[PDB]
UniProtKB/Swiss-Prot annotation, chain A:
There is a cross-link at residues 1, 86 (Glycyl lysine isopeptide (Lys-Gly) (interchain with G-Cter in ubiquitin)). This is 3C-like proteinase nsp5. Cleaves the C-terminus of replicase polyprotein at 11 sites. Recognizes substrates containing the core sequence [ILMVF]-Q-|-[SGACN]. Cleaves and inactivates human TRMT1, preventing tRNA guanine(26)-dimethylation of tRNAs. May cleave human NLRP1 in lung epithelial cells, thereby activating the NLRP1 inflammasome pathway. May cleave human GSDMD, triggering alternative GSDME-mediated epithelial cell death upon activation of the NLRP1 inflammasome, which may enhance the release interleukins 1B, 6, 16 and 18. Also able to bind an ADP-ribose-1''-phosphate (ADRP). It catalyses: TSAVLQ-|-SGFRK-NH2 and SGVTFQ-|-GKFKK the two peptides corresponding to the two self-cleavage sites of the SARS 3C-like proteinase are the two most reactive peptide substrates. The enzyme exhibits a strong preference for substrates containing Gln at P1 position and Leu at P2 position. Changing residue 86 to R: In strain: Beta/B.1.351. It is found in: Host cytoplasm; Host Golgi apparatus; Host nucleus. The lineage of its organism: Viruses, Riboviria, Orthornavirae, Pisuviricota, Pisoniviricetes. 3CL-PRO exists as monomer and homodimer. Only the homodimer shows catalytic activity. Interacts with host FBXO22; this interaction promotes the proteasomal degradation of nsp5. Inhibited by pyridone-containing alpha-ketoamides compounds 13a and 13b. In turn, alpha-ketoamide 13b (tert-butyl (1-((S)-1-(((S)-4-(benzylamino)-3,4-dioxo-1-((S)-2-oxopyrrolidin-3-yl)butan-2-yl)amino)-3-cyclopropyl-1-oxopropan-2-yl)-2-oxo-1,2-dihydropyridin-3-yl)carbamate) inhibits SARS-CoV-2 replication in human lung cells. Inhibited ex vivo by michael acceptor inhibitor N3. Inhibited ex vivo by compound 11a and 11b. Residues 1-294 are cytoplasmic. Residues 1-294 form the Peptidase C30 domain. The gene is rep. The active site is at residues 37, 141.
């Protein structure tokens, strides 16, 4: 697992405090983005009226700091589950950036932060049930997930909560949660998780590129036939987008995506028969087709 | 999980000599890079580096930091690292130190190509003084490091891939880790061993994640455990290793030698299918300090 260099995101991290509640914010040009539950108390986390907590609030109740230096808040609004604080200084370290909503299966780096300070960077996969298996502790909220393409940081994740089971949930940078979660301090269950088929196929491609190709067969399949069988093994069905992002690996190896699906269908039905693929009896599902190139 | 890489990204530059390009580290007014940049092909196999270095002019070295060229006003060599004095001081130079790490210790690697950061990841110095990185052509000069408060401890610079696919390099004084040499030859490492204290830290970790199917009631002396460990090419466990595991022992209520008893069972049986924190294999590149923080 290889994360993206974090320096461009580090230069954007700040801290936002309401009362005693401190979490992290993302400072881009003259706007600071953070999770709205920074405005909550204990007495109101069990179920908050965010619209009502927000009316009581004024610009001068928001403490925003880069380091120990205060940024003056000159405006505030709420977009879904994210708070947007307008500040009086444009971040001179603002990279080229966009806000993207990723699909389940896709990977991203997360810059874990506490009190506006980075502690670590690591590589996460958005599971099909819209959770990530991270290392977030208290005060990690507002940490973000991202990919870097050339000069451009694509922000895709902001952290909000840990689930009873120990995995994590959050939103895009527009405040829309990934999955069926809500930012209330209630017990919330992630739907049952499935294996990320497109990434397994990416991994088989990687194994072929490295000369490990015992598992290829002379058969092929339809996308519908493969999908129905894979769901019987708790694999995700494939979309048309999945097929398309396997194109470069299909072209590199000369093995059509549906031929690879047929090889996977056989692995699913018969098993490995005590063999390995890239030195592993387990099919890895957290390397995307873009990750394999790198 | 790796250290944030921003402080190091701001030091990475591109160094070129001839048709060879790799990365350099630019601290204050000196750029450090692997000396084999001053090579060719007729040289690859048995290079007399002092000899090739004396034939070199300051102006043969092209240093680019972003869109900017840096003027080399001086060059010297410290073991396998070339030190290029340049006419400008990097203003992004962080607080730093140069350190040589011990096998079993971990560090972050910022992989760079043509002076540009491309990825970051966490590695351990294997006991045979290799590292299991993903380095491709042109990644030479990439560095490994740790961060303590505001200070970057640099510990590795990347020089070569071995034919098995693992990697070899030097500290920032240019001394290789391991018996490797910066000549273009197929080199083998000594037989690698598994970092025992790290496997134990990682088992304590899975426990903290409420994963404990591997535990047991059996127990073991420290010597009897080491006898089994050595049998399976695991590093011996020292009493310092035991002391270091204390915090994780306290936090889980599992004595160090109880976890050793658990590890002994796993080595002799196997996992018999089951898995620990996702892995079918015992993971040995998380240290105790790591798993804490
Ligand atoms: C950031 O503020 C923080 C990050 C959490 C803390 C621990 N690990 C993590 O990711 N997020 C919260 O505290 C969040 C605030 C809500 C308003 C969304 N709540 C949360 O994450 O709760 C975590 C424990 C598992 C929750 C739970 C279990 C059972 C019953 C509950 F009501 C809640
Ligand atoms: C950086 O310049 C580069 C990094 C390597 C390239 C491929 N992956 C990687 O990490 N370092 C070298 O190319 C290095 C230069 C020497 C002069 C030290 N040589 C190298 O990495 O060789 C790799 C293969 C195992 C070498 C080999 C096999 C057979 C015969 C040989 F003579 C050498």
């Amino acid at each position: 697992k290889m994360a993206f260099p974090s320096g461009k995101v580090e230069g954007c991290m700040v801290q936002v405090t309401c009362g005693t509640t401190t979490l992290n914010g993302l400072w881009l040009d003259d706007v600071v983005y953070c999770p709205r539950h920074v405005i909550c108390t204990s007495e109101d986390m069990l179920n908050p009226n965010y619209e009502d907590l927000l009316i009581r609030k004024s610009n001068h109740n928001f403490l925003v700091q880069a380091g120990n230096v205060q940024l003056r808040v000159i405006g505030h609004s709420m977009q879904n589950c994210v708070l947007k604080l307008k500040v009086d200084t444009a971040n001179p370290k603002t990279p080229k950036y966009k806000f993207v909503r990723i699909q389940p299966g896709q990977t991203f780096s997360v810059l874990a932060c506490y009190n506006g300070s980075p502690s670590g960077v690591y590589q996460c996969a958005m599971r099909p049930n819209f959770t990530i298996k991270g290392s977030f502790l208290n005060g990690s909220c507002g940490s973000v997930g991202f990919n870097i393409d050339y000069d451009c940081v694509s922000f895709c994740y902001m952290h909000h909560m840990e689930l009873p089971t120990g995995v994590h949930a959050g939103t895009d940078l527009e405040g829309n949660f990934y999955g069926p979660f809500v930012d209330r301090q209630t017990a919330q269950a992630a739907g049952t998780d499935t294996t990320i088929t497109v990434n397994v196929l990416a991994w088989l491609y990687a194994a072929v590129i490295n000369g490990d190709r015992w598992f290829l067969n002379r058969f092929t399949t339809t996308l519908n036939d493969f999908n129905l069988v894979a769901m019987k093994y708790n694999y995700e069905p494939l979309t048309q987008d999945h097929v398309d992002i396997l194109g470069p690996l299909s072209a590199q190896t000369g093995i059509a995506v549906l031929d690879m699906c047929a090889s996977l269908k056989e692995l699913l039905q018969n098993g490995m028969n005590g063999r390995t693929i890239l030195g592993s009896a387990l099919l890895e599902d957290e390397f995307t087709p873009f990750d394999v190139v790198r």
